[PDB]
């Protein structure tokens, strides 16, 4: 059945989308908002009043006090907006390259493993966004490794903190320890922690 | 306790959101080891260079920085329709998100247009200035040897040659037979 | 005076100035001339305006700016002082302003000179530095007087 | 006595092509020249392939010059914000290692 309207001009739309992406900072947010709304309308997730952060007794336990204070340090209060955003940005296009909200973790006490899980969960719930900020994650995990697995860490870092892929597809590690910057995300380099080369 | 709510519900929300009109980029291939974004620029011989993805650091929008701590509420303090005991699942009308995708696309074409339009003019369009020196007496101004400046060629001609998959036209030195020029012109 | 050209009613002067300006060796101009955009932000940073000004002042202004830009010391380097005046292993973050917020490098040599000099002239300088350190101890809250 | 004199008798004479003793400004007052890569000012080259003479090399006064100057985007001396973050436990801090 005819619809007396002009055809969706696929090609022109992608071009103008690209120009807008080049010139209009607000584009990113616009698209996100659309996606956020969808999540908000799908009613897939709402915050609840009570927090199920600790197993019963462990919150009030006197020797748990550090781990509790660790978990409480990471465990932020829920907001529908921040959650829906977190969900939406897995699908939304990224334009300004993303950055991790940097964490200062020495990883002395065992409880510091929270931060490690905080990343692992992030990689599960949000593989995409994780993939954007992963080098910035690697800067933190390297402290965790050097402190927890010093010898494996010296071996790994001797191989190189990063690598590039050559045209044949083989990995090529730097041989050098260098701190990651997101400036590199757009370059040929990849964090070496995520190479999965044994 | 919540994993069903993630895999058996929210996953569909990702699957449909992935088909939305405005999620045009390929965000991630499922392999951390090898994935890199496809990277594009608007760019001209005239000298403009405008990356689509670029790293400027934290922006006013608040989209750039990511607090990963958001995972904790998602586990330890958020209810879901699936959990729990039975609750009706919402399937949003396409029309809302769709129609606002469309309204955004029209806002965008309307917005980029004056920029695109002015530049079409500053470009000077699909034409090039060209001197035509005469080589014989009784030559009309139309007749003679056509020639143009390199800047015009870069600006208007060369990109089209690149876009048509043909060899770059030969340079002409002192040692240049007409037959070579013919091979080049036909090339 | 190069602006008087074809505007002054005095004929000989306009002729003379036209001759000087039509020489190969001399060419008046009223910049902007040299733009310099950042490598990352791609916006203009230092620009070269050909002002009507004496060459001495221009040379001093340029000396100062050249100092500030050639240092390659951004505001981010202030963090290195902050670490020094902070409890060991404080971390500092952000915002990576970059080349867009340049500053002069901390002049180590000149400061140590002025310090040794003042310490020669002003022994009481001791009591100033002590006072600073005293305050830090006082704020670190390591030890408090008590009635017991 | 008139060592500072740039110009003189900016008037027309009704008979002669220029009044006697009239003084045109020196060409150097008007050679804006170029800022050099060093930051040194220079007059324009006198002939092709020559670098220009630095304006400070010589005693003429040049009243047009290229002063470099920062635009609004560059800013310096503004106070700068940061997230300072304290050590989690004072006992864990490492005073020592090289």
């Amino acid at each position: 059945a005819l619809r007396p309207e002009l055809a969706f001009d696929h090609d022109h739309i992608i071009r103008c989308l690209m120009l807008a992406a080049a010139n209009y900072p607000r584009l990113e947010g616009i698209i996100v908002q659309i996606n956020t709304g969808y999540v908000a309308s799908a009613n897939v997730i709402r915050p609840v009043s009570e927090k199920r952060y600790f197993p019963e007794n462990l919150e009030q336990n006197q020797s748990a006090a550090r781990l509790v204070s660790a978990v409480k340090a990471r465990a932020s209060e829920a907001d529908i907006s921040s959650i829906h955003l977190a969900i939406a940005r897995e699908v939304s296009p990224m334009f300004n390259v993303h950055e991790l909200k940097k964490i200062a973790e020495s990883f002395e006490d065992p409880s510091s493993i929270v931060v490690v899980l905080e990343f692992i969960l992030f990689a599960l719930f949000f593989p995409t966004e994780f993939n954007r900020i992963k080098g910035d994650i690697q800067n933190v995990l390297l402290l965790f490794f050097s402190r927890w697995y010093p010898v494996e860490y010296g071996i790994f870092v001797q191989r190189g903190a990063t690598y590039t892929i050559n045209a044949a597809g083989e990995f090529e590690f730097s041989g050098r320890n260098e701190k990651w910057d997101q400036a590199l995300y757009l370059s040929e380099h990849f964090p070496a922690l995520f190479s999965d080369v044994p | 306790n919540i994993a069903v709510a993630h895999t058996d519900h929210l996953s569909v929300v990702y699957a449909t959101m992935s088909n939305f009109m405005l999620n045009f980029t390929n965000n991630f291939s499922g392999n951390h080891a090898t994935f890199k974004p496809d990277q594009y620029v608007i760019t001209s011989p005239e000298g403009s260079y405008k990356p689509i993805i670029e790293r400027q650091g934290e922006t006013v929008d608040g989209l750039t920085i990511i607090d990963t701590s958001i995972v904790w509420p998602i586990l330890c303090q958020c209810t879901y329709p699936l959990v729990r005991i039975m609750e009706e699942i919402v399937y949003p009308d396409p029309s809302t998100t769709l129609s606002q995708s469309l309204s955004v696309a029209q806002v965008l074409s309307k917005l980029t247009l004056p920029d695109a339009f002015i530049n079409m003019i500053l470009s000077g369009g699909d034409s090039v200035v060209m001197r035509t020196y005469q080589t014989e007496a009784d030559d009309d101004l139309d007749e003679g040897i056509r020639m143009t400046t390199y800047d015009q060629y870069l600006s208007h001609i060369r990109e089209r040659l690149h876009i048509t998959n043909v060899p770059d036209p030969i340079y002409i030195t002192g040692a240049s037979t007409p037959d070579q020029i013919a091979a080049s012109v036909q090339a | 005076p190069a602006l008087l050209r074809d505007f002054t009613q005095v004929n000989w002067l306009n002729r003379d100035i036209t001759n000087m300006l039509q020489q190969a060796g001399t060419k008046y101009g009223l910049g902007l001339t040299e733009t310099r955009l950042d490598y990352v932000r791609l916006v203009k940073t230092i620009v070269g305006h050909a002002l009507n000004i004496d060459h001495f002042a221009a040379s001093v202004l340029n000396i100062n700016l050249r100092a500030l830009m050639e240092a390659n010391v951004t505001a981010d380097d202030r963090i290195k002082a902050l670490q020094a005046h902070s409890m060991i292993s404080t971390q500092f973050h952000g915002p990576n302003q970059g080349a867009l917020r340049p500053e002069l490098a901390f002049d180590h040599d000149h400061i140590i000179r002025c310090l040794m000099l003042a310490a020669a002239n002003y022994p009481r300088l001791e009591g100033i530095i002590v006072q600073i350190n005293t305050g830090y101890v006082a704020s670190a809250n390591v030890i408090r007087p008590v009635s017991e | 006595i008139s060592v500072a004199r740039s110009m003189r008798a900016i008037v027309n004479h009704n008979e002669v092509d220029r009044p006697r003793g009239a003084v045109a400004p020196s060409s150097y007052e008007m050679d804006t020249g170029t800022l050099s890569r060093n930051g040194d000012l220079l007059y324009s080259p006198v002939a092709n392939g020559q670098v220009g003479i630095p304006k400070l090399e010589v005693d003429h006064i040049s009243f047009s010059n290229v002063v470099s100057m920062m635009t609004a985007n560059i800013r310096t001396g503004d106070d700068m914000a940061v997230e300072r973050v304290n050590p989690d436990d004072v006992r864990a801090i490492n005073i020592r290692n090289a």
Binding site: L85, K101 | - | - | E83
Partner: peptide, 15 residues
């Protein structure tokens, strides 16, 4: 504590 997608600045260094 509360979620915040941005640097959580507190210090203001002087030049």
């Amino acid at each position: 504590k509360v979620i915040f997608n941005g640097l959580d600045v507190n210090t203001e260094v002087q030049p």
